[PDB]
Symmetry: C7
Amino acid sequence: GAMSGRPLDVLEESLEETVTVRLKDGDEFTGVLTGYDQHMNVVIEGEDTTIIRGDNVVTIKP
Amino acid sequence: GAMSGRPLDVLEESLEETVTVRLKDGDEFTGVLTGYDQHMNVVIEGEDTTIIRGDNVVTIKP
Amino acid sequence: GAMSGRPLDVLEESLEETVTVRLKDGDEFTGVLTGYDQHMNVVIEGEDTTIIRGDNVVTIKP
Amino acid sequence: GAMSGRPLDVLEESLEETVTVRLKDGDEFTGVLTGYDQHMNVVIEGEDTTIIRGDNVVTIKP
Amino acid sequence: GAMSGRPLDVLEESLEETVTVRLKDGDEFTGVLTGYDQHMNVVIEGEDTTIIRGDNVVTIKP
Amino acid sequence: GAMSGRPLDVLEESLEETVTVRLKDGDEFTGVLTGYDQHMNVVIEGEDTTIIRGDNVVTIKP
Amino acid sequence: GAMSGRPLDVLEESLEETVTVRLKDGDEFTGVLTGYDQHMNVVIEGEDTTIIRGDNVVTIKP
Ligand SMILES: O=c1ccn([C@@H]2O[C@H](CO)[C@@H](O)[C@H]2O)c(=O)[nH]1
Ligand SMILES: O=c1ccn([C@@H]2O[C@H](CO)[C@@H](O)[C@H]2O)c(=O)[nH]1
Ligand SMILES: O=c1ccn([C@@H]2O[C@H](CO)[C@@H](O)[C@H]2O)c(=O)[nH]1
Ligand SMILES: O=c1ccn([C@@H]2O[C@H](CO)[C@@H](O)[C@H]2O)c(=O)[nH]1
Ligand SMILES: O=c1ccn([C@@H]2O[C@H](CO)[C@@H](O)[C@H]2O)c(=O)[nH]1
Ligand SMILES: O=c1ccn([C@@H]2O[C@H](CO)[C@@H](O)[C@H]2O)c(=O)[nH]1
Ligand SMILES: O=c1ccn([C@@H]2O[C@H](CO)[C@@H](O)[C@H]2O)c(=O)[nH]1
Ligand SMILES: [Ca+2]
Ligand SMILES: [Ca+2]
Ligand SMILES: [Ca+2]
Ligand SMILES: [Ca+2]
Ligand SMILES: [Ca+2]
Ligand SMILES: [Ca+2]
Ligand SMILES: [Ca+2]
Ligand SMILES: [Ca+2]
Ligand SMILES: [Ca+2]
Ligand SMILES: [Ca+2]
Ligand SMILES: [Ca+2]
């Protein structure tokens, strides 16, 4: 198809795996990716759950 | 389905439980989550009711 | 139903009550909430009338 | 109805009357409001005519 | 009508006339308004053509 | 018609010609405009090819 | 057709080819373009997979 492996599809394929999320402020969050949505909001599970709002995200290393 | 546990579905299951919202300006708001919407606007209940506009949120930890 | 006490619904129930609105620039406005819209634009009646563009809002405390 | 006196409805009742618009960069513009739109762009007429793009607006005092 | 003299309608009444556009970075552009769109992108003609993206616009003064 | 010579229409008629794009960070890119889209993403080809995301654009000079 | 070589179409033609993405914070990512979407989110394959959110992108140079 078009668009190759879409970014949200790569996120779909990274469910239940450890990703690292880097935010515009410099902070990094590492933990299991348990959910995401169309805005690139992500749920990251480490010692506890973190919902990260997508507009803060610079990169995700899945 | 697709998307694991969507971020807004994790909010739904955090309703009436305690969460911490961290904003872009550095402020943190702890209290009971009593509502949310599509924009990730949140209602946090401490001694006061605090409506937080979604665009200010960095992370929500339930 | 879903989303608990939706943020805008709490606004609806805060009409004609005193609220405090804090802006990104750190200013605060206290007065009677006489209107709002789906952007979280709000009308605050103090000594005189203030319309606040929602995109400046950080928190609203009803 | 809902939302009380909507922010855009207050601007509707302030057409042909004097208002003060304050901008995110701190400038204020005073004059007769002669038009507006759903983005809250406004037309302010004092000695000059000024179209103000709504995303710059913090407050409007009708 | 509603909304008085809508800001984009003022732009229409300014086509083929000289206006002054002030940007968020402080620069000012004076020239013939030869076009605009619904985002308030404008084409300003001085000694040459300048297309200005609307999200940089603070004010337009016909 | 309305809106005069629309900005995207000026971009159409500047295809295959040389233009200067100035970004919010202050950088400038000069080259032949070989494409654009509704967001004002542009493709500029001088000695190499640069896709510029429209949200960074201040002005384009065709 | 209209719009010449659309920016997203240049991206399509760059799949499985090395490109270089520059971000607003100054960082640069070089690697194989393996995916993209309509927001200009991109997936860049270097030593690791990196998902880049579009709104941080300034330029992409294939
Ligand atoms: O839940 C949401 C909704 C929107 N946005 C993004 O953030 C921008 C500004 O808040 C929006 O335009 C959208 O791209 C999010 O990150 N999360
Ligand atoms: O009530 C609202 C309406 C919009 N937004 C978000 O704020 C962004 C711009 O301020 C919008 O794109 C949207 O994501 C909110 O947070 N709350
Ligand atoms: O009257 C309006 C119209 C829109 N916005 C919203 O402000 C954000 C940034 O301008 C966008 O979400 C936009 O929809 C307002 O705050 N007020
Ligand atoms: O003519 C326009 C078009 C859009 N916007 C608003 O500007 C913000 C983005 O620049 C969004 O809230 C958008 O609705 C305006 O203020 N005026
Ligand atoms: O590829 C894209 C997708 C979206 N946007 C911008 O994102 C904002 C969405 O309202 C607008 O400024 C739009 O031009 C871009 O610049 N490029
Ligand atoms: O071609 C353009 C010019 C301006 N914008 C504005 O940039 C904002 C991005 O926040 C949008 O909401 C819109 O108002 C576009 O989307 N596209
Ligand atoms: O996954 C997403 C979702 C939204 N946006 C951006 O958020 C804004 C929504 O108006 C636009 O700039 C759009 O390109 C992204 O960059 N990536
Ligand atoms: Ca996997
Ligand atoms: Ca799978
Ligand atoms: Ca009054
Ligand atoms: Ca009414
Ligand atoms: Ca009146
Ligand atoms: Ca009329
Ligand atoms: Ca005229
Ligand atoms: Ca003039
Ligand atoms: Ca020319
Ligand atoms: Ca031509
Ligand atoms: Ca080429």
